Design a protein around this nucleic acid. Structure first.
Ligand SMILES: [Mg+2]
Ligand SMILES: [Mg+2]
Ligand SMILES: [Mg+2]
Ligand SMILES: [Mg+2]
Length: 328
RNA sequence: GACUUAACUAAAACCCCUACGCAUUUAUAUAGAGGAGACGUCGUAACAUGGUAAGUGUACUGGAAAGUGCACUUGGACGAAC
């Protein structure tokens, strides 16, 4: 979805001069406008140039204007990356996050995901997904896509996972898992909860919430159970986890507040009961695929509007600059 | 005597050098010169009308006290009837 964007509007097409200016600004320890950065981003037309731009971005991030790094600039950068290589450099930036200060909580992410899908690369995609999760996102319908990707990854990834990875997986499951419309979403959520529960029990409660959008409160297994029950009112992995748990420093929890390692048999029983109920009443990848096939009516008008707004803003900025020059 | 960047949150940047010299001031230490104070010689200057009454000022003079001039003082006296 490229040709809607490629009316960028014209500016200066000399990068060396811009670079020099930037250096001078930094030499003096003076601030830099966002506009210049945007222009720089626009200009790029080589891998060396891309590298240079990256550096410049980093510098900006470490300056009196850490903020003002506008969405539009980020978008432009992403586009540039896509045009050239994309899957190493953008990813790297995302990983760095705080240093390049890119924070593209937008359709950019979706685009990136799509690109990744187009040229296989699974690990990278997973990483991207994780990064997105770490950022507070998931108002848009890319959530489904993310979930699908996660599922795909899981379909390959079937070992002991390990500390960070399990947590990441759980996070991925959870935040995109807000799909009240279908039982698949609920299942995903449950799975996520189970993973998180496992993490809690093996290692610690702090291990779960430390860096993630996740909440300190102890009952994760309980929460999962509740969620499951909700569905009934209106899994294998979870069972396995439970079984494992059953099989044979500071304290955030209280003396009165009961320890969840000493609530296991009861929990297991509850789970069993729930399962029975489900059976009485009455694959994941397939479901996800089906979902994908349905739905997906896009956000293109909105995107266009946003672009227009950005353009307007740019124009305003230019005008301001002109005024300043006149004054000078 | 020298002197702007940035503005979807708001912020960053912003740093001059020149007077002290055996110039000033006061004091200490001095080649040497001059007093004052303290403890034999030459006169006899003053004290008695002190042997030319004393003394003041000023002048000149003389080993030294002092001598003399001019004008002042009684801290001199003139004996207190003819
Ligand atoms: Mg005599
Ligand atoms: Mg006589
Ligand atoms: Mg004579
Ligand atoms: Mg004669």
């Amino acid at each position: 979805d490229s040709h809607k964007w490629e009316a960028r509007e014209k500016e200066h097409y000399c990068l060396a001069d811009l670079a020099s200016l930037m250096d001078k600004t930094f030499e003096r320890k003076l601030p830099v406008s966002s506009l210049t950065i945007s222009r720089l981003i626009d200009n790029i037309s080589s891998r060396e140039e891309i590298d240079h731009a990256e550096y410049y971005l980093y510098k900006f991030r470490h300056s009196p204007n850490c903020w003002y790094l506008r969405n539009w600039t980020i978008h432009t950068w992403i586009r540039q990356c896509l045009k050239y290589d994309a899957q190493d450099k953008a990813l790297y930036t995302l990983v760095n996050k705080v240093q390049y200060g890119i924070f593209p909580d937008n359709f950019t992410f979706n685009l990136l995901m799509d690109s990744f899908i187009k040229k296989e690369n699974y690990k990278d995609a997973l990483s991207v997904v994780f990064e997105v999760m770490m950022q507070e996102a998931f108002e848009v319908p890319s959530t489904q896509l993310l979930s699908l990707y996660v599922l795909f990854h899981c379909l390959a990834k079937k070992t002991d996972f390990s500390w960070e990875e399990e947590r990441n997986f759980g996070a991925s499951l959870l935040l995109p898992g807000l799909k009240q419309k279908n039982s698949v979403g609920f299942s995903s959520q449950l799975y996520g909860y189970a993973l998180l529960g496992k993490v809690e029990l093996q290692q610690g409660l702090r291990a779960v919430y430390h860096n993630m959008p996740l909440i300190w409160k102890p009952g994760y297994l309980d929460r999962a159970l509740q969620v499951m029950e909700k569905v009934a009112a209106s899994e294998a992995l979870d069972v396995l986890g439970a079984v494992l748990k059953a099989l044979t420093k500071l304290v955030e929890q209280l003396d009165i507040e009961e320890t969840e390692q000493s609530k296991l048999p009861q929990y297991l029983e509850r789970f069993k009961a729930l399962h029975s109920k489900l059976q009485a009443l009455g694959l994941t990848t397939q479901l996800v695929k089906e979902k994908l096939s349905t739905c997906e009516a896009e956000d293109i008008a909105t995107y266009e509007q946003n672009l227009q707004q950005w353009h307007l803003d740019l124009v305003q900025l230019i005008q301001r600059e002109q005024q300043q020059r006149e004054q000078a």
